[PDB]
């Protein structure tokens, strides 16, 4: 859920490194990466579309889990 907070202020020339964010996914470590990669690109695509990522976090992040079941549970574990 912190992706809109680490993209709106870190720009695009930044690297996001997780300690337990990837490995702490119930569906293994492979699904953990798909949970952040989908969440990251949704925030960017919302910023290019002129939306406010830091303000519309819930609606930007939730509409990507519909086409991505991994995020559909990643949003539930790290609620909210």
């Amino acid at each position: 859920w912190h992706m809109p907070a680490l993209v709106a202020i870190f720009g695009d020339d930044s690297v996001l490194q997780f300690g337990g964010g990837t490995h702490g996914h119930p569906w293994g470590s492979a699904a953990g990466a798909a949970a952040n990669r989908v969440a990251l690109e949704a925030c960017v695509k919302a910023r290019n579309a002129g939306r406010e990522i830091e303000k519309e976090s819930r609606d930007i992040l939730m509409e990507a889990a519909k086409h991505s079941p991994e995020l559909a549970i990643a949003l539930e574990t790290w609620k909210e």
Binding site: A30, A31, V38, E41, V44, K45, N48, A49, G50, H67
Partner: protein
């Protein structure tokens, strides 16, 4: 098979999300024009998708200040090369970098 994730191929960016509709490209082109970059279109065959340099179509639209003509160009390359990827790229003249790089048509 839930939850069993399989290794899947995306090109570089915006591939994990569903294919872009016609309206999303409108806003992306509006943004890339508003940033002052120069839109540019490339295409290659999916077999050589890992190549460093793609093929131009045709030249970068230097000094282009309207999105109403770009939407026509992207279709011509696709109908000329129906089995090739179509990349929409933006060129930054000052920093010599790319502001946005995402495949628009995945290649039939």
């Amino acid at each position: 098979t839930v939850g069993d994730y399989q290794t899947v191929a995306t090109l570089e960016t915006f591939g994990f999300l569903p294919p872009m509709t016609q309206d999303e490209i409108y806003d992306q082109i509006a943004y890339i024009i508003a940033q002052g970059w120069s839109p540019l279109i490339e295409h290659v065959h999916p077999s050589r998708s890992m190549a460093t340099y793609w093929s131009y179509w045709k030249l970068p639209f230097f000094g282009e200040k309207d999105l109403g003509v770009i939407v026509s160009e992207l279709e011509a390359c696709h109908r000329a090369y129906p089995d090739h990827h179509v990349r929409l790229v933006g060129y930054d003249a000052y920093t010599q970098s790319q502001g946005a790089c995402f495949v628009v048509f995945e290649g039939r």
